Amino acid sequence: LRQEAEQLKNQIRDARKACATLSQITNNIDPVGRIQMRTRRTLRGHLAKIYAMHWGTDSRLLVSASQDGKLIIWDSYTTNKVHAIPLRSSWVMTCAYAPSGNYVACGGLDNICSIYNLKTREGNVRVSRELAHTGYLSCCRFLDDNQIVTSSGDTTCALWDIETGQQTTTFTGHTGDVMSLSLAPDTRLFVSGACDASAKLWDVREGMCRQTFTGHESDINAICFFPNGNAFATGSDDATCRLFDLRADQELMTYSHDNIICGITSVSFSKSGRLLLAGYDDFNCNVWDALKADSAGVLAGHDNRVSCLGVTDDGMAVATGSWDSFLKIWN
Amino acid sequence: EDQRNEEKAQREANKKIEKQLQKDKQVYRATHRLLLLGAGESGKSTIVKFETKFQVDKVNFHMFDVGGQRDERRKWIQCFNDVTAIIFVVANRLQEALNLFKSIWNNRWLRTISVILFLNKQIEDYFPEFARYTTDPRVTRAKYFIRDEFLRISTASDGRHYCYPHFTCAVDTENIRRVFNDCRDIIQRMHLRQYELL
């Protein structure tokens, strides 16, 4: 049976090599030129390492989450702590913001994802429905105001339904940690990184893989999704971002500069998908061209790490929450 | 002009949260965290002491625990790099502990953490160097050889963090002062080595 698996895999490899880099096509197109940007506001409010920040859909708010035991709903126009949501799970490995600005998500080493309601009518911000996985919980996202697709270290992405708190579906088949996950803009299918170099795509409705991938040399820290849907980038622990594709079952370019050896920690595109941000581990934040890979402008501002990154839903203000308690809203 | 009321509405929230945070930080910076990897204690954290707090001389300790967590440790251990002392209860068998300890030491984010240690287990076929080493000795040879191996792993990286091997196998009544007194030293040395004075 293992020999038959090897034969089938050789067939898949032959097919994917017969159906095959965007540089040779886009080699004369006009470049973008040098570009740099400065910290417009410094959201210095935290008191521990900031591990995630889901930049809200309003393009104004943002929810940052830190291991201090706090969850502060910031602002990006006058820099005020609109809320200060305390948690019972002292650690937090991710936060999530509903698309209608109506909910937030949390949850880390304590294996439990939780839901805080901010648009309340009785004062205090209370936990709505904490739902529970055997393992940590390293991502959360929102399809609508009551559907969350968590990742886990349990190796199993598991779509939930907050009403009555059940696993509507349940995904599995990785044999390895599941670090990050994105969601398509039309919200119908979503990639899901892992710790086997396995950027296995999935389908939200049925509950099985559609066209997996494996093209990296180490685990995957964080993943993204092209603004349209017919592409998605990926970072790994070998200082490389790889612009994959989900229409051709392979990649289209590898981003790599021999001057750096470290591990990507979060990725996100621009609006036009032209500038591929990245949060490295030697404290900077490179920017990569779309089809003309080169480190154009380093946004080195931080001092300990770059734990996450985000871009407004209209491409206005990047914001990188490092490990020293200080966000920074570039522009 | 009606857009001049939400300004004060927002600044009052600002000035209330900048009065609650400056009163929560004064209890965040007065409790030191911990960690209890390597093995679940059940003899040093449940009967003698997933948080599990306690207090000695008006100071509190968030003695965490990862017992319910999985086996692959390369992802939920890089987010404990701000703790003060990674307690380490430990009892082939010993070579696995040694290869866990060497990795925790030479790690890049856990680099500057002062690993306390606990030989709760208080041989020659799995260790051939047992005869060519010298400090009833039927227990001292074994005990001090295990400890000498751990310290020979610890003294090869520096000077930012030292292993503090202890020993405990009895009822462990005063097994909390051995952590309090030995966590004071980590702050003392963390200041001395910074004042260029040690």
Epitope: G176, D237 | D71, R74, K102, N107
Partner: nanobody, 127 residues
Framework: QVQLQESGGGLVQPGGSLRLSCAAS????????MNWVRQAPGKGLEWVSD????????SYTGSVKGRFTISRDNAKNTLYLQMNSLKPEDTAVYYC?????????????????????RGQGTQVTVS
């Protein structure tokens, strides 16, 4: 895709000599710290050897000092664990494991299951 296969092995009386190999392709080999791992049939995974990323800092377990000899090859993409003077308790499946991160000085690889850089593993026993 990363590929970590093995070779050699079989059934040999005590005092024999086996020279196992390991075919590593898919990733750059010159900067990943390797190590072998044996699993006694009927027991959990154990540790036997390792090596630095330049053949410099070889180590071993306790009861396998001196007998064996591990040596990489940073041009042919192989890892050879020359075995000498076997024993009754040296029967196990031998995996050609690896370590997760490039340019590392640590390993988190001897795990109960679910590791994606740990080959199928040949079998070596003693009669």
């Amino acid at each position: 895709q990363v590929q970590l296969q093995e070779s050699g092995g079989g059934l040999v009386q005590p005092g024999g000599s086996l020279r196992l190999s390991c075919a590593a392709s898919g990733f750059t080999f010159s900067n990943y710290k390797m190590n072998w791992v044996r699993q006694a049939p009927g027991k959990g995974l154990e540790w036997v050897s390792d090596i630095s990323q330049s053949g410099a800092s070889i180590s071993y377990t306790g009861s396998v000092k001196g007998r064996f000899t591990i040596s990489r090859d940073n041009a042919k993409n192989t890892l050879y664990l020359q075995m000498n003077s076997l024993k009754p308790e040296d029967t196990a499946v031998y995996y050609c494991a690896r370590c997760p991160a490039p340019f590392t000085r640590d390993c988190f690889d001897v795990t109960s299951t679910t590791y994606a850089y740990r080959g199928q593993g040949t079998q070596v026993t003693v009669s």
